[PDB]
Structures are given as structure tokens and as C-alpha cells.
Design an enzyme around this catalytic site. Structure first.
Site, PDB file in Angstrom:
ATOM      1  N   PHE A  13     -40.620  53.828  61.083  1.00 13.17           N
ATOM      2  CA  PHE A  13     -40.953  55.033  60.281  1.00 13.17           C
ATOM      3  C   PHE A  13     -41.515  54.595  58.935  1.00 13.17           C
ATOM      4  O   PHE A  13     -42.085  55.462  58.289  1.00 13.17           O
ATOM      5  CB  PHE A  13     -39.741  55.960  60.118  1.00 13.17           C
ATOM      6  CG  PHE A  13     -38.574  55.352  59.383  1.00 13.17           C
ATOM      7  CD1 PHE A  13     -38.520  55.353  57.998  1.00 13.17           C
ATOM      8  CD2 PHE A  13     -37.531  54.774  60.085  1.00 13.17           C
ATOM      9  CE1 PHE A  13     -37.451  54.770  57.335  1.00 13.17           C
ATOM     10  CE2 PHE A  13     -36.462  54.200  59.420  1.00 13.17           C
ATOM     11  CZ  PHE A  13     -36.425  54.198  58.047  1.00 13.17           C
ATOM     12  N   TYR A  26     -38.803  44.495  48.704  1.00 11.26           N
ATOM     13  CA  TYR A  26     -37.745  45.544  48.628  1.00 11.26           C
ATOM     14  C   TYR A  26     -36.365  44.966  48.259  1.00 11.26           C
ATOM     15  O   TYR A  26     -35.494  45.746  47.848  1.00 11.26           O
ATOM     16  CB  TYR A  26     -37.816  46.383  49.906  1.00 11.26           C
ATOM     17  CG  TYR A  26     -38.973  47.351  49.879  1.00 11.26           C
ATOM     18  CD1 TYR A  26     -38.995  48.382  48.946  1.00 11.26           C
ATOM     19  CD2 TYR A  26     -40.066  47.217  50.723  1.00 11.26           C
ATOM     20  CE1 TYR A  26     -40.058  49.268  48.859  1.00 11.26           C
ATOM     21  CE2 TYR A  26     -41.134  48.102  50.657  1.00 11.26           C
ATOM     22  CZ  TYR A  26     -41.130  49.132  49.723  1.00 11.26           C
ATOM     23  OH  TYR A  26     -42.158  50.024  49.624  1.00 11.26           O
ATOM     24  N   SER A  69     -43.521  46.555  54.652  1.00  7.33           N
ATOM     25  CA  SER A  69     -44.904  46.043  54.854  1.00  7.33           C
ATOM     26  C   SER A  69     -44.931  44.530  54.595  1.00  7.33           C
ATOM     27  O   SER A  69     -45.677  43.826  55.291  1.00  7.33           O
ATOM     28  CB  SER A  69     -45.892  46.767  53.982  1.00  7.33           C
ATOM     29  OG  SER A  69     -45.599  46.543  52.611  1.00  7.33           O
ATOM     30  N   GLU A  70     -44.154  44.053  53.617  1.00  2.45           N
ATOM     31  CA  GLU A  70     -43.994  42.605  53.310  1.00  2.45           C
ATOM     32  C   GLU A  70     -42.516  42.322  53.019  1.00  2.45           C
ATOM     33  O   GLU A  70     -41.822  43.247  52.574  1.00  2.45           O
ATOM     34  CB  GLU A  70     -44.841  42.181  52.106  1.00  2.45           C
ATOM     35  CG  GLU A  70     -46.238  42.778  52.059  1.00  2.45           C
ATOM     36  CD  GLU A  70     -46.890  42.723  50.684  1.00  2.45           C
ATOM     37  OE1 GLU A  70     -47.974  43.325  50.517  1.00  2.45           O
ATOM     38  OE2 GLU A  70     -46.315  42.069  49.777  1.00  2.45           O
ATOM     39  N   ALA A  98     -47.208  53.914  48.628  1.00  2.46           N
ATOM     40  CA  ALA A  98     -48.528  53.318  48.331  1.00  2.46           C
ATOM     41  C   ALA A  98     -48.813  53.420  46.838  1.00  2.46           C
ATOM     42  O   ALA A  98     -48.509  54.464  46.236  1.00  2.46           O
ATOM     43  CB  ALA A  98     -49.609  53.991  49.146  1.00  2.46           C
ATOM     44  N   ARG A 114     -49.813  46.441  39.317  1.00  5.99           N
ATOM     45  CA  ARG A 114     -49.129  45.742  38.192  1.00  5.99           C
ATOM     46  C   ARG A 114     -48.981  46.695  36.996  1.00  5.99           C
ATOM     47  O   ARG A 114     -49.135  46.243  35.855  1.00  5.99           O
ATOM     48  CB  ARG A 114     -49.900  44.467  37.831  1.00  5.99           C
ATOM     49  CG  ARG A 114     -49.916  43.415  38.935  1.00  5.99           C
ATOM     50  CD  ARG A 114     -50.882  42.280  38.635  1.00  5.99           C
ATOM     51  NE  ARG A 114     -51.083  41.334  39.735  1.00  5.99           N
ATOM     52  CZ  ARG A 114     -50.360  40.232  39.957  1.00  5.99           C
ATOM     53  NH1 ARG A 114     -49.346  39.910  39.168  1.00  5.99           N
ATOM     54  NH2 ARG A 114     -50.656  39.449  40.981  1.00  5.99           N
ATOM     55  N   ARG A 115     -48.678  47.969  37.256  1.00  7.98           N
ATOM     56  CA  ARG A 115     -48.528  49.021  36.217  1.00  7.98           C
ATOM     57  C   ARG A 115     -47.133  49.648  36.307  1.00  7.98           C
ATOM     58  O   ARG A 115     -46.913  50.676  35.639  1.00  7.98           O
ATOM     59  CB  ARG A 115     -49.623  50.074  36.398  1.00  7.98           C
ATOM     60  CG  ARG A 115     -50.213  50.573  35.090  1.00  7.98           C
ATOM     61  CD  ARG A 115     -51.258  49.607  34.566  1.00  7.98           C
ATOM     62  NE  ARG A 115     -52.515  49.753  35.285  1.00  7.98           N
ATOM     63  CZ  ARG A 115     -53.383  50.743  35.104  1.00  7.98           C
ATOM     64  NH1 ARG A 115     -53.136  51.701  34.224  1.00  7.98           N
ATOM     65  NH2 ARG A 115     -54.501  50.775  35.810  1.00  7.98           N
ATOM     66  N   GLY A 116     -46.246  49.055  37.114  1.00 11.36           N
ATOM     67  CA  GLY A 116     -44.847  49.481  37.313  1.00 11.36           C
ATOM     68  C   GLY A 116     -44.730  50.837  37.993  1.00 11.36           C
ATOM     69  O   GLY A 116     -43.712  51.513  37.759  1.00 11.36           O
ATOM     70  N   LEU A 134     -44.640  51.446  41.398  1.00  8.69           N
ATOM     71  CA  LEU A 134     -43.676  51.333  42.522  1.00  8.69           C
ATOM     72  C   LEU A 134     -42.247  51.439  41.969  1.00  8.69           C
ATOM     73  O   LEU A 134     -41.461  52.218  42.541  1.00  8.69           O
ATOM     74  CB  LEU A 134     -43.889  50.023  43.284  1.00  8.69           C
ATOM     75  CG  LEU A 134     -42.929  49.805  44.452  1.00  8.69           C
ATOM     76  CD1 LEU A 134     -43.015  50.951  45.452  1.00  8.69           C
ATOM     77  CD2 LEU A 134     -43.200  48.473  45.136  1.00  8.69           C
TER      78      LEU A 134
HETATM   79  O1  USS Z   1     -47.153  58.084  58.270  1.00  6.06           O
HETATM   80  C1  USS Z   1     -45.990  58.363  58.138  1.00  6.06           C
HETATM   81  C2  USS Z   1     -44.884  57.448  58.732  1.00  6.06           C
HETATM   82  C3  USS Z   1     -45.281  56.930  60.118  1.00  6.06           C
HETATM   83  C4  USS Z   1     -45.110  55.369  60.196  1.00  6.06           C
HETATM   84  N1  USS Z   1     -45.647  54.902  61.258  1.00  6.06           N
HETATM   85  C5  USS Z   1     -44.935  53.667  61.603  1.00  6.06           C
HETATM   86  C6  USS Z   1     -44.940  53.347  63.010  1.00  6.06           C
HETATM   87  C7  USS Z   1     -45.960  54.042  63.891  1.00  6.06           C
HETATM   88  N2  USS Z   1     -46.798  53.259  64.845  1.00  6.06           N
HETATM   89  C8  USS Z   1     -46.286  52.232  65.730  1.00  6.06           C
HETATM   90  O2  USS Z   1     -45.134  51.879  65.813  1.00  6.06           O
HETATM   91  N3  USS Z   1     -47.388  51.716  66.485  1.00  6.06           N
HETATM   92  C9  USS Z   1     -48.630  52.440  66.064  1.00  6.06           C
HETATM   93  C10 USS Z   1     -49.992  52.329  66.488  1.00  6.06           C
HETATM   94  C11 USS Z   1     -50.990  53.155  65.911  1.00  6.06           C
HETATM   95  C12 USS Z   1     -50.638  54.096  64.910  1.00  6.06           C
HETATM   96  C13 USS Z   1     -49.286  54.204  64.494  1.00  6.06           C
HETATM   97  C14 USS Z   1     -48.272  53.376  65.070  1.00  6.06           C
HETATM   98  C15 USS Z   1     -46.233  55.339  63.626  1.00  6.06           C
HETATM   99  C16 USS Z   1     -45.638  55.807  62.151  1.00  6.06           C
HETATM  100  C17 USS Z   1     -45.599  59.666  57.385  1.00  6.06           C
HETATM  101  C18 USS Z   1     -46.629  60.581  57.040  1.00  6.06           C
HETATM  102  C19 USS Z   1     -46.316  61.756  56.378  1.00  6.06           C
HETATM  103  C20 USS Z   1     -44.972  62.018  56.065  1.00  6.06           C
HETATM  104  F1  USS Z   1     -44.672  63.171  55.419  1.00  6.06           F
HETATM  105  C21 USS Z   1     -43.934  61.116  56.404  1.00  6.06           C
HETATM  106  C22 USS Z   1     -44.248  59.930  57.069  1.00  6.06           C
END
Ligand code: USS
Ligand code: USS
Ligand code: USS
Ligand code: USS
EC number: 2.3.1.-
Lengths: 391, 391, 391, 391
Positions: A391, A119, A114-115, A79, A86-88, A90
Site C-alpha cells: 500500500f 524511514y 521506496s528506499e 512525495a 532538501r527543504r525539510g 518530508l
Molecule cells: O496509490 C496509492 C497507493 C497504492 C500503492 N500501490 C502499491 C502497490 C500496487 N502495485 C503492485 O503491488 N504491483 C503493481 C503493478 C502496477 C501498478 C501498481 C502495482 C498498487 C498500489 C494511493 C492513492 C490515493 C490514495 F488516496 C491512497 C493511496
């Protein structure tokens, strides 16, 4: 401002940026559980004081063709604050993590995007394909040839954790795209299974000795059952579970996010009843070490021994010899016969995309069409590539 | 009542049944043009006096892997009156035409299916896949690697018939699924290109030396351009035409009904912008003569010589030897190593479906997983299977 | 300004007001055909010079319970210019036509209402109920008991005018709500049957010796067939026609505007498949002469002879004696046992509304609940009331 | 596997099957309250160990025409596991309960149907009609004749339980379709009245001495008020409550699930403003003992004494004599004048369906049209049949 590994003091600031960046943010309690998968020095933050950028990787185990399991850096929780675009930030954060990932000895990195437009320029190529099937189960009739014309039980997910764990563990080791699911992610999965006030409905499980389906009725469409996950080790298990799902007589529709080679449509007298309602990139791969990655995976036995020279753009040039389902990949300054960007190799690696298709887009360059056919056949996966969990 | 070849007197009755059966009925004038493709004895009618059933086949030329062109019976204009359902009229008409088609010496029959649950039981398997891509062209940016970063002209279709004919003729001979498009179907295509009061808008063409796109703005969605047909002989032509289509600055979306291996998504910096909005079976195949069909097509050179015994259910048993991209297919009473219904062979024939996928559904039975991999590799098409035109 | 019978010179001005007032305006050619049903002095106009108000009645023949046919003034083409609202032009025009209708010797007037809140105050009560049924024909299976488990033919409507005319003529004489359909309205109906560029699709007919259905595929919903009209003289004809309509295998849905007592739902194993998608008032009645109307219709034989005193508000008071399915209705100054407004009597007259239901709303006043039950039973129609055609 | 009365140990397994089968499942706490209405031996389960089938009946009191109250077996909580479809478990469970219900001395059984195509074959006929009216209250004006041109109070439902109980008790005894509502169902109703986080909004009550309305604003459509229940003992109460509901000035629409004879439309100057938006079968009846059921209910006094012979298919043949609003129903081997399946008698029993309508569908067979008219008149209900509460 500055790029640092975060202290314990930084994590509340990271959770704020997470909450503001991710509509699906799992909340601080769940995030704290997922941290246990982040190694020491697996996280970076940019401070301006407050967190304006973050990125991390988790220690994962990814199955690739040949039932080979690779240590994999799983990028996540990436994030940039809306105040610092736009500050480089990422580019800076991705460069630092890749440095740490490479030095740590990971042959591959992976993420969910996410998009789709972001990547590719950091060397990630889409490596699996999500394929949503929606079945109008009111018309669904099984073919005379379909197995199992009951071995399946309707159960509460929380009461059969041991059996789901054991079935999943068998599945992930035999399928390219398989991920080891650690204990904390089983804790998280079975918590999400329960109903939430003004949230998701109760999850049910269909349990076979060699497969399970987790499903729940949709929040708002009460005639739609959504299969969150179906893990089948045998064709008999896959068919038996689908017979049970088509038996949900109170539903009009069963939806599942599956892979393009799901045999479900062929189980029915009308293949058209299994409609593709959605298609998207799943897992993205960045090959960190080209020779380690190419030597690690198995190749199709059907293609006869061949040799070529592969150049990855700013990724090395290699003498590549493939025979008896194995590859040898050694340094060379000999003339390149194949050129591609690193992202393209990621897209080929699990067999989800054909070299011929990427060549037609000029993402993969060679002057030998015979070499193209041989790459296509060699990188093909016998077991179709599937997606494990996001993930 | 009775099943007969129709007289000239029957065709008004056939047009009435057509109008009542087909919402897309092309009308008596166009239907009379398509008749010129129906051979003597290519049509059957059931009379009760009035026409309550009809079916016919047209003389087509179908390209299969290896750039081999097969004479093909194209079934079409198949209707049972709503007054005469569940009377076995379709089964009677399909049995008579198949008899005539087999005796005439056609190795394959083909159709487009009104529904997916009907033609499997008469030995037709879905052999091509329609894949609709919708591009949000406002976000579409071409990759640095994409060719042609103009060779393309915006033209009136009727003024460049000769060039479209010549490009299409090159396309259909080099692509599995290609059909010869006779002169009457070019007359019909260019008539449909013009605008209709309260109907479709004017069609435009984008013309390259080695490809064309025919497109029109959607009737009701005035921000959607629909590509009716894009025929590209080279990757340069395909990219150049897509650069022009993304240049339709008054549109939000460009849609095309294409094939799963269309390289379009790989031409863009964001592959996700080329969204799969729809997927359906295209051309269906019934293999009329198993040995003639299997010997006629080319096979992948990459797989080493192998021998097996193939049984088609009520379709013969054959010693099948595949090597050097050719098959020999001879009678045998030796034990079957592979069993499948005739429809399944149709689905394998153009390389659109994997033997492994059909095996996973038990539509294809063997006890040798090595044989399965060899079939998969052998029946694979180097040039991806495309769909020519609907009939 | 002034209220006059229109001259030939007024009709272009009337067509302009019609075009501006009626989105469904049939156009001057069709309107000129419908004029042939307007008697001398059957039309009024208000001029301000230009036409700002118009109203007319046509000479109709309406079937009422007992298979009795009444001469009926059919009000139609009623419009006030948007420039001349709230000027009492409708009240003036309705008062003049009612005067002419009463003096001409019509016992009843009838209309179809543009809105439900307008005609009650001029003594019109809704007398028939339009009931739209939509059948999901993909699930529709006929009950074991349903007749005719073919007598029906798919035909071009224009080629079987004589048979439709003869079937309709039998239908309209046996059903309360039936209207004589004159030759000009058959000319108009069969012209509307043909397809229009950017308009309605071609109409087809299903023809039985004792019934017909006219249907067309919907303009925009190509999976919906709309039955414009189904006239069945026997239950066998009604079932046979519905078997044929459920045989329209290219449709998902068949819709019909029918009556509440249509037996269609009871022909199916699942009565719920015949869904009521719409309900509205059909024909409206104004009883012009209370004693003539009440004496003219037949009454239920099941109710024993009874006598009462009926007062219609500003419509007379009558000694009403009903026995042996006949009514005698004579002047009296004896105390009223039943009171109602004229509109309420219209609503009771064809048996579409129960006296008990209108009493519960206090639209019908009596202190004797036994009298209420006897009215209910007496005014009930053995043959359910249907709607003929809109005017 | 086996069919048994469930032990206390079975109820958690039954709740799991319930949760998986019923999207509206009331949860274990509420289900445990509804059990108090299930007699000893009122429940069956099929075990394979886990519950794969269940069905039960509750002890109900149903009002039929003549204000006669019958003991009624209310079938409910009927489910087959999606793993055990097409195994004849429903047929086995329905046969056992019907045996127990018949032997226990219930003259009728009743249910609410999840689908319309299922219960007809077990002798249940749809006996009441649900009729949803939607009023656009912005245009709604009461007729000059409408009563009560305030006696009504806006109240919290939980604070006026005693008054709702007393009004409902008067309503259910005077209306065919009325059910006794026991104390546990009042506990459940007033719990559902309160607001739920991310659930239904707060319920309000409009209270008259002789009627109440329970209503709540729709979850998502904040301009729609849904009347869950309106119980009016007098026409004055019904009108007064509707005046109050039309006074909900913050709403565009008031919806109610009512009966076809609801006088609401006749209270308004525009009857069309009360739109029928939905129609479905309500209560289903299986007549367990034909003579007991037919002798128990009252008949129309208006029809003169008549005698016939009624055969119910596999349900007995009876000499049926109806006069002075009473029926005598005795065994006979005399020739049948009327034949029907058991389900058809259920549909006639409360007067919701006409014998003539069922005869037109051939669900009811006689050769005497006079007998048909006499059945129609006799089985008619003076007080229109309403639906009490779903179970
Ligand atoms: O936050 C993440 C990665 C989790 C990415 N998510 C991606 C996928 C998920 N989900 C689904 O697939 N359906 C969901 C519906 C509601 C809420 C979550 C949903 C759950 C996880 C995280 C946080 C702290 C860390 F140190 C490391 C990692
Ligand atoms: O009638 C046929 C086969 C034509 C099948 N159609 C199938 C495909 C077509 N279309 C499209 O692809 N889009 C269309 C839009 C409007 C109308 C037609 C469309 C056109 C043809 C026929 C008639 C008489 C014969 F002797 C032999 C054969
Ligand atoms: O203009 C009328 C009355 C006709 C009322 N219409 C009412 C009903 C009709 N229609 C339908 O039912 N569906 C239609 C669809 C498109 C157009 C018309 C439709 C047709 C007639 C008229 C004109 C001149 C007269 F002298 C006397 C009378
Ligand atoms: O579970 C039942 C029968 C209840 C059937 N339901 C049917 C009708 C009801 N509902 C409504 O009418 N609207 C509702 C909204 C949300 C939840 C329930 C709603 C409530 C009851 C049961 C359980 C255990 C028994 F022993 C015996 C019986």
C-alpha cells in the site's frame, strides 16, 4: 510554503506530483478508489498555486501475534517535488500526520518504503521480510511425505471473487502481517487480473476450498510464471496449490514473493530447487503508543514470567512484565535494563527480527544476556509473520 | 565389481577420478595433505584394474548448541566414474562407510552436498544455511548506535598465522557449526592466500585482537572484494572489521558468504544496502546415534520441562525428556507422539530449521501443536548456527 | 617485391608474421614440428629485409568416397602483412603454390578458411560441414532401442597413445574427410591435452576398444564439457561413449563439433535435446586434376550407368561415364550438358552438397533435370562425410 | 473422469484451458475460425463441470514425394490442466482420436510438438526440419552466377491476397510438406500482417509473378527483419526476392525459418554470411495405415527394383517391392529383413531423415547394409521437404 489538509481542488495537483514521483502510479481512477480508505484529515499537502509535497494515511486493520487485530494508520502517497528537495518538507509532513495519527488513537502506523535509508529516523523499523523463491519446476519432484499424493481447480479470477474474499478473510485473521482487504481493493485486484495491450498477460487462479494462487506468465520471459499472491489456510491447501503450479508444464520457472518460513522447499526431494532470488524489507512499523502496542499482542507461552524496565529513546520508560503469553506495560522512573530507539521496537513487534540480532548491532542495549534470551523467546511469533498486500 | 579399503597403489587412480569428477579438485599435493585427516579404514574404493568409485570420511570436531564438541565423521571425496552411473555404487559405498562410522563410535556424520537431491535418502538433512550478502559500499553509512565510531590492521596473512589460529580456535568453540581447523588446513589456507598467474589475486587480512577478515579482489570483477572468511569473537570486532571493509574505497561492492543472523545490515543507516544475493544449504548432518546426539547438545532454558515419545523412521523410538537445558533420551515401546525421518532430525539438530516449518511440510508428524511449539523453542540455538569451512 | 622459397633465415620473419596474423598461433616450437609435413619447395614468401607474405602446403592423405586415399596438398600458414594489403600478394602466392602442387602430381588441394568469402575465386569449394551439437545432459535419457543398455574406461590421454593412434587410423581409412594423422601431430595433440596455468583445463579420455572421446571442461563455463574429438569405428562404440559423456553428472551441457548426420539425437527419447548451436564450412577442396579426381573416387551403385559431358570453367571439358560405382572421364569437344566453376566440383566431391542445391543457385548449369537427379545420386556418399582435424 | 466429444457449452471451458496452456493462444475469435477445419467428432474433452483435458484434429491436405496429396488428420489444441497431470489423460485422448482418425480412413496424422520427448511413444516421428538462417546483409554480395543481376514489388499484403493465394497454391502442390491453406487461414494470416499497439510492427510483402516474401521488423531488435514466409515456385523468383531482402538497407540482419536445402548461401560470394542460428523438428508424422501410406508416395527412379519384408512394431509385417518409382506393400508372415517402430517410418516418409542415420542409432534394424543403401536412395525426395505453416 504552507502545510494544509487538501481541498477537492488540490487532488489534480496531487495526481500530477504522483505521476511524476511514482513510476508504478495507478492513475487518477484507481487513486480515487484508494481515497475511500483515507479518513477526513488523513491527508496533508505543501503548496508553494501548485502542490510540491503530499502525504496521507489510510485506515487499516493489522493482525499481530495472538491473532489480535490493531487499527493501523497506513502511510502512502508520500512525495516531495524534485524542485523542492532538501527543504525539510518530508519531516514537516511526517510530523503533522504522526500528530494526527497519535491524537486519533492509532497504536501503530505502517508503510512500504521506496528506499531503506529514509524511514528509520521517523521511528519506522522493518517488521516483515519479503523472500522471493524461484523453482526450476522441470526438476521439481514432491517428497514421499508431502500431503496430497484433484481438490484444485484452474479458474478465471473474476468468476470466483466470493471464494477468494472468504479464503483471504480467514488467512488475514490468523497470520501476523495480515491486513483486512476492503471491497475497493478487491475491485482493483480483479481489474489488474485482466490482460492489457502491450501490458501484463491474463491472470489465472488455482482454487482450493482452503487456499488460492493468483498467477500470470511474465510479460517478456514467457517461460516464467509469477505468483502474485498465494493465500493458504491449511498445509494441505498450500501443498495442493504447489502440486498444481509445478504442473504448469509450459513453464521452466515459478517465482513467488513469500516469507522466510515458507515450507515449499521441504515439499521437494531437492530443497535447493526453491532458490532465494531476492530478499527485502516488507511492512515497516512505527509504534505510536508503546504501552498500548506491547499490551495488545500475545507472547510465547514457553517463556516463564519475567519483569524488566524498557526505555524507548524519547518514547517513555516502562515496567514490562510478561507471563502466560500476556504483557503488562506501566510507567516507571526505575533504572532502565533495556534501551532501544522506537524503530527497533517496530522491527521486534511482529517477531521478524530477534532482539539478540539487534543487540549484536548495538541497536538494542542491555547488560543482561539472560534478559536478551527471554525477550527473543517472548517476542517470537508461533505463526510466522507474512506480508499481506503493498500500500 | 568389489568394495575395498584402498592400498597406497589405489591413490593415483583415486586422484584421476577426483580430477575428472571435481572441477575444484585441489590437486594431488593438497589432497595428500587432507589425507592426514582420514583415519585407517576411513576410505572405500570400487575397482572394476581402475577405480570407478570412492568415498572417505575425515576425523572432525563439530561444535553444537551448548558449546559441546562432538567427534564427527566428515564425508568427502565421494565420486562415481561417469562410465559406472546407475549401478548402485554410491549406495554400496555410503552403506559401508556408515557401518564403519557407527561401529567406530561417531554420534554424527557431516558433509557438503554437490547437489541438494542426493543425500536426504541416506539420512543427511541440511543443518546450516549459507547467506551471501553484497554491500554497495559507496552508499554504506554506519548507524549512530554502531560500535567503534583504529583497532584494525591491514596485514599479509602469512605473517600473522599464530593470531588467526588463536582467534579461529576461540570462534569455533563458541559457535554451533564450528569445526576444529587442524595445522594441515592452516598450511593449505595460507598457500591459497597468495596470488596465482592467471588465477586468484593476492589475499589481504584485516586483523583485530578479537577478529579477522580474509579478502581478495575478484579475478574478473575488479570493483568486487570477496571476503573468504570473517571470524569475530565480539560484536566490537565484527563492527570494526566491517568499518575497515567499507573503507576499501577502490571497490563498489563487498560480498561475504555468511549466516542468516549476520548483524551487518543493522550496523548501516540503510539495512537494504546489505543485499542477499545467494542462499544455499551449508553443512548436512546424519545423526548416527539418536540418543547420544540428543543427550549431548544443550537446549533452551526458556522452555519448561516436558516429556514426549520421538520415533525416527528405522532409527528407534525414544522417551525424550527436556528440562533445565538438558535432554534424557531412553528406549520405549510407548505410542509415538512425534515421527520424522533421520534427515529431518539432522536439519533440527543445530537450530537452523524450525520443527513448525518441517511439520508444515509433513516431514515431521505430530497431532499436538503445543508439543510442536515446545520442540521449536527447545531445539532453538541461543548463538546462531554458522558454517566453519567447506570439506 | 619478390616471391621466393624461404631459406632457414626467413623462418623467424615468418613466425613474426604468423604471431601478428593468427590469434591461435601455435608458437615457434609447435610450428617447427608442423614444418616436418612441408615438403622441399612447399613454401613461398614475399620479401619487401622483412617477410610481408607467406603460404605453404603440407603433404596430407585424404580419404574420399569408396575408401580411396588421395595424396592432398594441405594449404596452411597463409598471411599477408597488414602493411601490404590490396597489393595482389595472396593471388601471386596462391598461383605459385598451385603451379608447384599441379606439377608435383597432387590431384587435389585442401584448406580450412579463415573467412568464407576469399577461397572460392581460387577454385576452393566448401566440401565438409561442421555441426556443433550441445546436449542438456540433465534431461538426456537413452531410447529403449539404443545399444549397450561398462566397455568404456575413463583414462589419462598420454597413457593410451597407442590405442588412440590405432582407433584413429581405422576411423580415417573408412570415412570420407579422414586424414592420416602423422606422429608429430600426435605429439602436438597429447601436449595440448595437459592443463595450462590461466589456460585450458586438463583433458580426459573415454576409451572403448572401437572408439575414444577426448574432452575437457570449458575454461570459464564450468558446467560445459567440450568434446574436442570423438572417433568411433562402430555404432556400439559411438553409443557407449555418449552414455559415458551423459554420465558427467557435474556438467549441465556436453558440446561437440560433429557432422550433420551424427546419429546422437536418435539415441535419445527427446531428439530436440541435441541442439545445433553452430554450423560452418569445414574442409575446402580445390580439384587440381578433374579427370584424376573424378576417376579416383567411388560412386553410388544404386544409380544405373549414365553418360554426360561436364565442362569445368577454364578446367577442361570431359566425357563422363558413371556405372558400377566407377567413373571414366576423358577429353571431348562434344557439346557440354553440365557447366560449373572448379569450386563447385570441390563442394560436390565428398557428397556434402547436392548438385540439385547448387543448380537451384545457378552455380551448376544443365537443361536436363533427369541428369541433375543422376548426379545427385551418383556423387552421394554412403558413409557420411566427416571432418578429421583442422590444419 | 469421462472422455466425450464436446458440446457447444464446452468451448468456453476449452478456451480457458487453451489460454492457461498456450502462451501463443490466438484468442476465442481466431480459435472459432480454426474450428471450421475440425470435422464433426474431430474433438475430445475430459471433464472432472470443468474441462481438464482436450485434443482435436483438423482436416488437412499434405503433399508427399511424387506430388501426391494425402488427406491428413492435423492434431492441435492438445492440453491437460496443470491440476490433472500424470493421470493418463493425454494417453486416453490420443488413443480415442487415433481410433476415430483410423476409422475415418486417414492414412496419416500430423502435428507440431510443444516438446520433443512426448509424441514418439504415440508413433509420431519428426518428418521435416526447421532451419533458421540469419544473413548479415551489410556484407552480402551476390555471386556472378546468381540469376537476375526489377521483377519484384514492395506491396501491402492485404491488397494482393489473390496473388499470394495463387502463388502459395502452386508451391504447396509441388513441395513435400506442402499444406492446402484454406480461406479462414488466409483471413487469419492477413489480420496478423497489420501492426498491433505494443505488439508486432506492420508486415510488408515483396511480390514476384512466381514468389512472395512476407516480412516485418522485429518488435525490440529494430535492425532485424524477420521473414515470416517466403514461397518461391522458381529459382529466379527465390533469387529476385533475396536481392530485394538484401536491399533492406536500414537492417543489419535478415532472418528466415527455412529448410536445410535452402540454396540462399550459394547465391552469395561468402556462403558463411547465411548463418544457421537455430534448428528444430518441424512437422511430425504418424503413419496410420502403413500399406496405404507406402503405396501412395513416389520413390526415386534411380534405384533399381528391389523387394524386402518390413515389420513395423505392432503395425503389421509387409512384403515391400519398390521399382519404377512406385511401391507395392502387401501382407506377409515371411521373415522380417527390416524392423522399426511406427515413429521411425514417419521420420523416413518425407525424406528428411536417412534410413542409414536411423540404423546407426539402432532405431531401424536390418542385417543387410545393401538393403539400407537401397532404402536410403528409394525414400530420398528429389524436391527437398519444406514446412508449410504451423498448426
Ligand atoms: O496509490 C496509492 C497507493 C497504492 C500503492 N500501490 C502499491 C502497490 C500496487 N502495485 C503492485 O503491488 N504491483 C503493481 C503493478 C502496477 C501498478 C501498481 C502495482 C498498487 C498500489 C494511493 C492513492 C490515493 C490514495 F488516496 C491512497 C493511496
Ligand atoms: O579434496 C578433498 C576435500 C577438499 C574439499 N574442498 C572443498 C572446499 C575447498 N575450496 C573452497 O572452499 N574454495 C576453493 C577454490 C579452489 C580450490 C578449492 C576450494 C577446498 C576443499 C580431500 C582430498 C583427499 C582426502 F583424503 C580428503 C579430502
Ligand atoms: O600453424 C600451422 C598450422 C596449424 C593450424 N592450426 C589449426 C588448428 C589448431 N588448433 C585447434 O584446432 N584448436 C587450437 C587451440 C589453440 C591453438 C591451436 C589450436 C592447431 C593448428 C603450421 C605452422 C608451420 C608449418 F610449417 C605448417 C603449419
Ligand atoms: O489454436 C489453434 C491452432 C493454432 C496454432 N497456432 C500455431 C501457430 C500460430 N502462430 C505462429 O506461427 N506465430 C504466432 C504468433 C502469435 C500467435 C500465434 C502464432 C498460430 C496457430 C486451434 C484452435 C481451435 C481449433 F478448433 C483448432 C486449432
Amino acid at each position: 510554503v504552507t502545510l494544509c489538509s487538501p481541498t477537492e481542488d488540490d487532488w489534480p495537483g496531487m495526481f500530477l506530483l504522483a505521476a511524476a514521483s511514482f513510476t508504478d502510479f495507478i492513475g487518477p481512477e484507481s487513486a480515487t478508489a484508494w481515497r475511500t480508505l483515507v479518513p477526513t484529515d488523513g491527508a496533508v499537502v505543501v503548496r508553494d498555486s501548485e502542490v510540491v509535497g503530499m502525504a496521507l494515511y489510510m485506515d487499516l486493520r493489522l493482525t499481530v501475534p495472538g491473532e489480535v487485530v490493531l487499527p493501523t494508520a497506513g502511510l502512502s502517497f508520500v512525495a516531495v517535488a524534485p524542485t523542492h528537495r532538501r527543504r525539510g518538507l518530508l519531516r514537516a509532513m511526517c510530523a503533522e500526520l504522526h500528530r494526527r495519527i497519535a491524537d486519533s488513537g492509532y497504536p501503530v502506523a505502517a508503510l512500504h518504503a521506496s528506499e531503506g535509508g529514509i524511514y528509520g529516523r521517523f521511528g519506522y523499523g522493518p517488521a516483515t521480510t519479503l523472500h522471493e523463491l524461484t523453482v526450476d519446476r522441470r526438476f521439481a519432484r514432491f517428497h514421499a511425505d508431502a500431503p496430497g499424493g484433484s481438490s484444485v481447480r484452474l479458474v478465471r479470477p473474476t468468476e470466483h471473487r466470493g471464494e477468494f474474499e472468504a479464503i483471504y478473510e480467514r488467512w488475514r485473521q490468523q497470520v501476523p502481517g495480515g491486513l483486512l482487504r476492503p471491497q475497493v481493493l478487491w475491485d482493483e485486484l480483479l481489474a489488474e487480473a485482466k490482460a492489457a495491450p502491450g501490458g501484463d498477460r491474463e491472470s489465472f487462479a488455482l482454487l482450493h476450498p482452503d487456499g488460492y494462487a493468483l498467477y500470470r506468465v511474465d510479460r517478456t520471459d514467457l517461460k516464467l510464471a509469477r505468483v502474485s499472491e498465494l493465500r493458504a489456510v491449511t498445509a494441505d491447501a498450500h501443498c495442493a496449490l504447489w502440486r498444481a503450479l509445478i504442473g504448469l508444464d509450459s513453464m521452466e520457472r515459478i517465482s513467488i514473493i513469500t516469507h522466510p518460513q515458507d515450507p515449499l522447499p521441504h515439499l521437494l526431494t531437492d530443497t535447493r530447487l526453491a532458490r532465494t532470488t531476492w530478499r527485502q524489507d516488507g511492512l515497516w512499523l512505527r509504534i505510536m503508543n508503546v504501552p498500548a502496542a506491547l499490551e495488545a499482542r500475545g507472547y510465547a507461552h514457553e517463556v516463564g514470567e519475567f519483569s524488566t524496565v524498557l526505555e524507548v529513546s524519547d518514547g517513555g520508560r516502562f515496567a514490562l512484565k510478561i507471563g502466560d503469553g500476556r504483557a503488562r506495560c506501566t510507567p516507571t522512573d526505575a533504572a532502565a535494563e533495556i534501551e532501544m530507539d522506537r524503530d527497533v521496537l517496530g522491527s521486534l513487534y511482529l517477531g521478524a527480527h530477534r532482539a539478540s540480532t539487534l543487540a549484536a548491532a548495538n541497536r538494542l542495549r542491555t547488560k543482561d544476556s539472560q534478559l536478551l534470551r527471554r525477550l527473543d523467546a517472548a517476542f517470537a511469533s508461533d505463526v510466522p509473520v507474512q506480508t499481506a498486500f503493498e500500500f
